[PDB]
C-alpha cells in the first residue's frame, strides 16, 4: 500500500529485442488484462506500477496479489515462483463509502 509510488513509463513502443526478461499477464479488478515484460531477477515493484499505469489509476486502488499472497514492492517473480507468460490477480480495494 505505502509503495503506491510510481514514475511514467509508459509504452511507446515495443520495438526492442529480447533477453533474459520474461513476461507476465495482469487481470484486473475490471477484467483489465495487462500485458507486460520483466525480468526474473528484477523486483515486481516495475511490474505493480507498469500495469497499473496502464490502467491509468493509482496503486492505492487496487490490489495485487498471486497465489492468495500480497506482491509487495521488494517481491520478485522468481522469488514468488512465477515464471514467461504468468498471470497475477488484481483486486479493487477502492472504496464506496
Do not use: W
Amino acid at each position: 500500500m505505502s509503495d503506491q509510488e510510481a514514475k511514467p513509463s509508459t509504452e511507446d513502443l515495443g520495438d526492442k529485442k529480447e533477453g533474459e526478461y520474461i513476461k507476465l499477464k495482469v487481470i484486473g479488478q475490471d477484467s483489465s488484462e495487462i500485458h507486460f515484460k520483466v525480468k526474473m531477477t528484477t523486483h515486481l515493484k516495475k511490474l505493480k506500477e507498469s500495469y497499473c499505469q496502464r490502467q491509468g489509476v493509482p496503486m492505492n486502488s487496487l490490489r495485487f496479489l498471486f497465489e492468495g499472497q500480497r506482491i509487495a514492492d521488494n517481491h520478485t517473480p522468481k522469488e514468488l515462483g512465477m515464471e514467461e507468460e504468468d498471470v497475477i490477480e488484481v483486486y479493487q480495494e477502492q472504496t464506496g463509502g
